[PDB]
UniProtKB/Swiss-Prot annotation, chain C:
Packages the positive strand viral genome RNA into a helical ribonucleocapsid (RNP) and plays a fundamental role during virion assembly through its interactions with the viral genome and membrane protein M. Plays an important role in enhancing the efficiency of subgenomic viral RNA transcription as well as viral replication. Attenuates the stress granules formation by reducing host G3BP1 access to host mRNAs under stress conditions. Belongs to the betacoronavirus nucleocapsid protein family. The gene is N. Residues 1-114 form the CoV N CTD domain. A motif (Nuclear localization signal) lies at residues 6-14. This is Nucleoprotein. Homodimer, homotetramer, homooligomer with RNA. Both monomeric and oligomeric forms interact with RNA. Interacts with protein M. Interacts with protein E. Interacts with NSP3; this interaction serves to tether the genome to the newly translated replicase-transcriptase complex at a very early stage of infection. Interacts with host NLRP3 and ABHD8; these interactions disrupt the association between NLRP3 and ABHD8, increasing NLRP3 stability, ultimately leading to increased inflammasome activation. It comes from the Viruses. Residues 8-111 are annotated as: Dimerization. It is found in: Virion; Host cytoplasm; Secreted; Host extracellular space.
Length: 84, 108, 114
């Protein structure tokens, strides 16, 4: 809904969190008999490039915001997208 | 028909249709038990819940408002907190009513 | 100023008579302070010439509860209902460029007040 994957793969998301430190991005095959892979992006950026993968298999890119503790910590949650 | 933020959820037009499924995602609503999802503003205990919803003025006066720009588009972000009055005779029932609706979906 | 105050904070209407600072406290960086409004909006509340153009982004009650990440916080300062979300501007609307211009004016205004 808010996460976009513009081909050439470039992931982009709006900052919906209070006092973001950094992000944690996970990616692997939707379903899939592997664990997701995990890399970190500075607080200041809200894009990331994903290279590798495979065409034809579905992917789930999830964005996690690591943030200062606040009144909104308790209710926060990731953004995700599915593409191929 | 109406833009999301102006939509009224009713018996005809459920919370799921108007506001999407309840969910853990930052951009998903988390509030409402099965009964609320199904009745919206027709819900028996709506005005007990509605007394906590800000007016336009108070929305813009109390909250923290941001702007975020990306491909998906342009998002106006809002973040705030409404202080419950603990002298209020009905304080307890206000709390238990709110807590029953928060994160309800996780158990259904 | 006496009657517009008795209302609980979240049902108050800011006017020239009862202003944004009176209704809703100072603009500030603190987690429970507001940060929207230039000096004219602050002083004028809902009498601002362009209030309806800001109003249209305010959520109905249904939407407040339907869209937001809703939360509870229990602290020595008391018990709080927390809310966050995001409202998508329609960039297909003819006034989109103006909407952005108007809201920019106000967002974190207080930080460039003389």
């Amino acid at each position: 809904e808010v996460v976009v994957a513009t081909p050439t793969h470039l992931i982009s998301w709006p900052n919906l969190w209070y006092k973001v430190r950094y992000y944690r991005i996970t990616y692997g095959e939707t379903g899939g008999n592997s664990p997701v892979q995990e890399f970190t992006v500075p607080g200041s950026k809200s894009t990331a490039t994903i290279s590798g993968l495979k065409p034809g298999v579905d992917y789930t890119i999830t964005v996690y915001a690591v943030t200062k503790r606040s009144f909104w910590s308790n209710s926060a949650g990731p953004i995700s997208i599915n593409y191929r | 028909k109406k833009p999301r933020q102006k939509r009224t959820a009713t018996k005809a037009y459920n919370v799921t249709q108007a506001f999407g499924r309840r969910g853990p995602e930052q951009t998903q609503g988390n509030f409402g038990d099965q009964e609320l999802i199904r009745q919206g503003t027709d819900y028996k205990h709506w005005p007990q819940i509605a007394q906590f919803a800000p007016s336009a003025s108070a929305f813009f006066g109390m909250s923290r408002i941001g702007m975020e720009v990306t491909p998906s588009g342009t998002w106006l972000t809002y973040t705030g907190a409404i202080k419950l009055d603990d002298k209020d005779p009905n304080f307890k029932d206000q709390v238990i009513l709110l807590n029953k609706h928060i994160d309800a979906y996780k158990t259904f």
